[PDB]
Design a protein around this ligand. Sequence first.
Ligand code: NA
Length: 261
Amino acid sequence: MAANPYERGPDPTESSLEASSGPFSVSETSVSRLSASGFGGGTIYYPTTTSEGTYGAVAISPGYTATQSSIAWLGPRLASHGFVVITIDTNTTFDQPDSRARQLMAALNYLVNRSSVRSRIDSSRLAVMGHSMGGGGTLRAAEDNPSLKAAIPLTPWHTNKNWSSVRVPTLIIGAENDTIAPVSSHAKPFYNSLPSSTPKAYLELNGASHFAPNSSNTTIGKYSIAWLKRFVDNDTRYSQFLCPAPHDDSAISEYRSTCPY
Ligand code: NA
């Protein structure tokens, strides 16, 4: 048995992370706007099987004026690698980033305490993600809830540029050609303000617009899965994708260098 009790699924490959679906079959259920205390309802995607143990959970927020349909593809994509995922609607489509941060935490609270799949969730291993103003909300949730295990803002938008108190592992995904939350005034200032003692990464999508996160995207899927695995599951089998090195090769037992050059 693997030393890490949170490892789920077979050893990962680039192929298996780029594919449309991971190793786990996915089921879905929903929570109505009325039943959802403190948020606008959502769809819950979960692995049908329970025989490998409980899973971490992830809440995902859409952006300004948007609904679940703009982030829906992330549900099956991420859940099929071993996570319980809720794609939320917000109380109103005009909610600002700090309101979305509270709604992300309210959705996690619902999943852990009241949802029909709460028994397959490890309530100590939670994460937040979001698009645009939902990505701004992701940063605020990570700042205010340091017990979160991972945060992934997608083309984030926020008027606060200083995230120097974030102590949650954070992967920021920016879109090179974003004209709505330009990376020069949003994503990059956010990344630069995060502490260097916090595990972090910035991934910029070549040629991409603000709406790249709203449809199936091999790169967003690959690195979001690797980030959630590495930090929600402590799964160091995924370090090879986040921090590649020649010694990932089976023929190479060690590799040192004075890279970059
Ligand atoms: Na509600």
